[PDB]
Structure formats: structure tokens, C-alpha cells
Symmetry: D2
Amino acid sequence: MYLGRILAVGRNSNGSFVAYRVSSRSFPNRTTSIQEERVAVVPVEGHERDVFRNPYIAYNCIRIVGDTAVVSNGSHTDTIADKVALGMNLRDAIGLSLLAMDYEKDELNTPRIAAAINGSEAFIGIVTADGLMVSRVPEETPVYISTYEQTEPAATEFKAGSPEEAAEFILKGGEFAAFTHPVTAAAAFNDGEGWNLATREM
Amino acid sequence: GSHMYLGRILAVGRNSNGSFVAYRVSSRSFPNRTTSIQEERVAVVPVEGHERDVFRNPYIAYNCIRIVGDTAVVSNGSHTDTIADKVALGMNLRDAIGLSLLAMDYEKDELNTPRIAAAINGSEAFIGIVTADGLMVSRVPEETPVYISTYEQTEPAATEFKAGSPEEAAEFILKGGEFAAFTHPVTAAAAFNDGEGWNLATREM
Amino acid sequence: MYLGRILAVGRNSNGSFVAYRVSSRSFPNRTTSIQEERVAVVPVEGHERDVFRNPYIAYNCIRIVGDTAVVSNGSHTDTIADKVALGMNLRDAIGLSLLAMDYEKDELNTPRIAAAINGSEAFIGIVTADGLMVSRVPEETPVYISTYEQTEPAATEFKAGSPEEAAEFILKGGEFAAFTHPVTAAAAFNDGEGWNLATREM
Amino acid sequence: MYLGRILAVGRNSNGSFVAYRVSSRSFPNRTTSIQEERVAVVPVEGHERDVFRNPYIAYNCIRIVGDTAVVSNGSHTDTIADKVALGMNLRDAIGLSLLAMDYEKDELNTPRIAAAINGSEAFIGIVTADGLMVSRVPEETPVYISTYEQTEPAATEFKAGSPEEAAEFILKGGEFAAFTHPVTAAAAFNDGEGWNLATREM
């Protein structure tokens, strides 16, 4: 039931999207911050220091490069987004980044999860201590994946017609309500006019 | 389910008799082929008088099995040497397979044929595949062997694979167990290790 | 004085080009055959068998994909060209392919050499047993590289205004005359109308 | 005369080493901190906040894995070390990490530089906007490389018989005295008994 960090990607009747939600046991003093073309996961005021005791807690979790949205549970968000910007198809951007960066070297060998979507295709990947897998997101249905328990894409009837909605949904909505220790959430949505960002706190 | 033609098939794992990797060609338009054991490897080559086939299709001849030290590599194409070499030059199994599938990619033919592969040694085993919809490399479950093919069965599938010798294993993936049902069997090869070392073997239809 | 296989890439007053030329001691029974969008290095009639005794002799030495031309001394030619086709900048297409394929496992640990060019940039790389290097081709001057001896880019006042010209030059022209054991050659040229292929025999 | 971040690697009469030195114009409020099996570049007390305005200033510069020492100017220090730890040869570890992570997306397209050394070989590599290069370190002589100006290996008569010496030298000694804006320095030395770490401030 505690899935750790969760991300979602796909298309529904209202447009394309990516959603991210932090779930933590020992580092709840965090929030999401919208900056130019990106959403970062940072410590809340007075906890800046946390970053220096654990290197996997702060990072951009959503990057927007052109017509492409990138979402991941770590710094690989920039590694992948940079490859997209510099010209590289989605699948390889994810694969090359997950292969090189690998699972996180902590207590639980925490997988690095990620996904990216543009006007044509979307891909979702994950790298664990037991494997690496990058796959196409089925057009007929959005999907989500997490660091713990749900280590492989799972379909989700994800309704949302705005980044606000998406971000709230992965936080407290639908089936995500049953996953524990929700901290902060974020998302990007594109109804065809471009990517818009939004956050959502508990 | 309607299709029983899986194309090229490979299997890997450990049973009560030891470790192994098996491979079997299945073709519709290039049956003029067989497996030839050479030093530390098994190649898939045209049969005499068909040497020419290789120049009309670059995906029909390749080492399908490579042995490097305590490690056995198996695949449906030239990546067999790309992976084997990385293992030889020092690279863990998962990465070796993954870096090689990522670079080489699915085969650029009529059916965007996936590149499949697997490798095993004294400690772990990893199986992987690269298609036009993805790339996947995963640890082979210790409690059960598994197999994968270019068509239909594009993700690992468990198999009660019995055999206690390369001869046995190569025969099994060719005509035994559930592999019987997969059509157009051409040639087969395999590598087995009972703890003494890797031994190769071929099997014709 | 025997550089093995040699390739050249760059631009001159007449257009963009890539050139290739095989140089062999023990496998001269070879020629270059133009096919759709590519030039392959194959055994001469009655030698089809050679390929089974050495896996590094037959291969497409030039691939044209869109506005981009790819040239190498091996099968990586297709690895790199596919990544360009599927969308991947030139530097990475060459780098990823060279890193993964590595030097050829023969008597001389023969390096894998490659280059790619389009209307904007051009890159040349090589992978040996002592390293890996991929670099931008200097706009103000073509350059060449070979499997042996000249294992790093070298400038070349390369004149030619057609594939025919280019293929003949790298084979018997300029400084390439002094490099021994010339077997067959090939080249692609682009004067602004598209890529055109041409072979040249001794 | 400002080479940015500089690293050195090689063997001398006293043993094997890797040295690192930060040089900065706009972020001198930094020091090096030894922690388990590694040395990190971090903000000085009261500047924790800098980490959030620039994602390229805090990182482990040195990582020790077994008989191998890794040094770099970025997070790729862990990317490379982890691959080495998980079983990967030095050349590929550096090449796969530099290919995936790329030059740093800042004002100067700052290259990612790196090097690794164990009881047998040593390799140094760099990734820029113009290329990628990874090469074996010449056994008969140590070499150093930087982000700016000296973007290619360069020989250095690097004398030192202890991490303290090594660290001091890349900071204020020899030819490094002439490189400007020294902030902090660090190094790992191995005289055959194992890898020892040390830092040095201005």
C-alpha cells in the first residue's frame, strides 16, 4: 500500500498529461515549487539542511521541453529532458538515462522511475536492481508506476482537464487515495494549447 | 494465440541438473540453415550451396551462443558478440544486455523483428528484449527457467525445462515440451553446465 | 603506411560529402555495390564464402537517411544510421554505437571508425582498445580517419564536386595515393540537391 | 588562466592518486567534506541555499569503490562509481556516464570531466558540446584536465606521497599555482595499503 514516489502519464478526453506525487515516511518536510518550464521537489523552509543528509529528496520532477513533458522521481528528470531537447526519441532518452543512472543507492535500492509524452507518443520506464524496462504507453489508456510495490505500469482511469485536477487526483483521487503517506503533488497538462503546471498540497 | 509461429526462440535457467541456455531457429522463408559448433560458440549458418542467402538478408547468420568464462550468452543475432564481449571485457550481465539492446535496436525488416538475448553464470541470469515499442531486461527467476521469442511471446515466460546435457536441452527447445507447438522449426543449439563447465551441442529436425 | 580502412567527411566549395575506401592485405576479393540509399562492401563473385571466415569484411559502408549521410568501416553504419533515422543527434548516434559495439575482436583489435553529416553539422568518431572519441568536424576543413596509423582525425584539402570524384580521390587521389593496398572505394556527395552515390575500383 | 574545475590522475614513485580542485568565480562559499568512502563539495555553513540556485555546485567529487578511485566535477562521480562497483570496466563506466549525462546546461555549456584508476589501469574522460572523449592514462606519466581551457589530457610531473600532499599540490603547487580562483581541493592517494582521503583549503 505504501508505493513511495508515484508518477502517471497518458491521454484522456481532455488532453495529455503527466502527474507526480511524493510519498515519504522519513522526509515529509517537502513541497513542490513551480519554476520556469519545471516543477521541483524541495525542502520546506527551515529544512534546507535535509538535502545534505539524503541526496535523493530534492530534484525537478517535471520538465517541459517544447511539446514534450518529462516526469521522474529524481535528477534523471533533467538527464532525460536534456536528451529530448538535444534531439533523441523518447524511448532512448529514458533508456539511456535509466541504464546509466541506475537504481538509487539507499536502504531499499529505490528504483528510478520516469515517463515522457509529446504530441505523438509517450513512454514509461523504470530501472531497478533486478532489471530495466522502458515501454510505450498504450494510447487507449493512461498508466502509472511507483518506486515500491507497483514496479510495472498499471492502467488508470485518470480523469482531469487541467494540471490542478491531475495533481489533485494523483494525491487524493481515485485509487491513489489508498496509497499512504502522501506529501506533495505536481502535474503538467496539455489540452492542445501547450503545457501548464500546477501543484497540490495535502 | 492464433499464431503459433514465434520466430526465433531462446530459453535460459537452472534446473536440478545444472545451468543452461537453449536456442532454436524458426523460419518461414530461410529454412536452408543449420547450427555449427566452433570454439566456445555456436553459429547459425546457411547450409551448403546457400552461402548466398547471407547477402540477401543480413539477419540470418550470426553466433547464437557464446561462452565467455563462466558466462553463457545466447541471442537471435549479432548482438550475441556485442553482449559476450562486454561480459568478457568486464560488465555485469544486466548492463551488458541492456547497453547492447539499446544501441542495436529491433531488426529493420518487414516485421520490425525484436532483438532478444539472455546470459547466465554461476550467480545470476538476465533475459532481455528490444522491440519497436520498448526495451526490457530482467533477472531470470532462480526458481524457474524462462523463454522468449521474436514473435508472439515477446515477454519472458516460465518453462519446466528438463534436460541434463546440451544435447537434451537443444532437442527440447526444438521438438520437446511446449516448444513442440511452435511452428516452422529449422535448427537448434544449446549450452549446458553441470558444474564442470559449459558444453555445447546442436540438434537438427 | 597501410592505414587499413579509411573514411573522410566534410564540406568543400562544391558541397557536402563522405568517402570510404577499403584497404586490405588478406581480403582483396571485394568491391562496393550501390543499393537503395546505401553502398555495401561485398565479396566479388565466387568469394561469397569469405564472409563466413571473417565477420568484419562485408557491411554497408555508407547509409543515407534523409538529409544525413553516414559512413563507417563496419556494421555500425546501420546502428548509427538507424539512430539518426529514429531521431538522435549525430554526436550521440555515433557515440552510443561506438561505445556499445567496441573495437573489432580480431588480430589487430581493429578500431571501429565512423562519421555523419547533414546540412548543419558533421561528426567523426573512432573506438579503439585504448579509448573512445567522437568529435565535431571543423567547418573550415574536411578530415579523414583510418583503422590503423591515422587513428585520430586529420585535415585534408579534399576537392571533388561529385560522388564519382570523391570516391576516386580517397582511392587514388591526393595524399591517399601513398596509403597502400587500395581495394575498392565509394562516396556520397551533396551539392544541395540531395545525396548521390558512386563507386570506384582500382 | 581560469580552468574552472580541475582533476588529475595517475601514478608516481609513491603510489596512485586522483586529485580534484574547485575553481569558481561566482560560488566560492564552498568546501570539501570527507565522508565514508568519498569526498563531497558542499556549501559552507550559511550558504546551504546556493544548492537551489545552481544544481552543479554540490556533488561528490571523489568516490572510492574497492581498489578503484573515481574523480569528477559532477554527480557523474556516483554514476561512474556505481557502474564500477556493479561490475563495469573503467573505460565504459566513464563513457556510458558521460554520454548519458552530457555537458552541463549552464551559461558556458560546462563540460563534465572524470577519471578512474585502480591497480591496473587508469582512464580519463570529458564530455563537451563538441564531443566526447575517454582515453587510457599513460602509465609513464600523470595527467590532468579541466572544464575550461585545458579540455584535453595534459601531462603533469605530479609529486605527492599522501592524499594531503596531492590535494595541496593540485590546489597551490606546481603549474597549478598559475590557475586562478582556487576555492577548495581534495585527493585520494594509495601507496599500496589502500585509498586514503584528504582535503585542503586556501
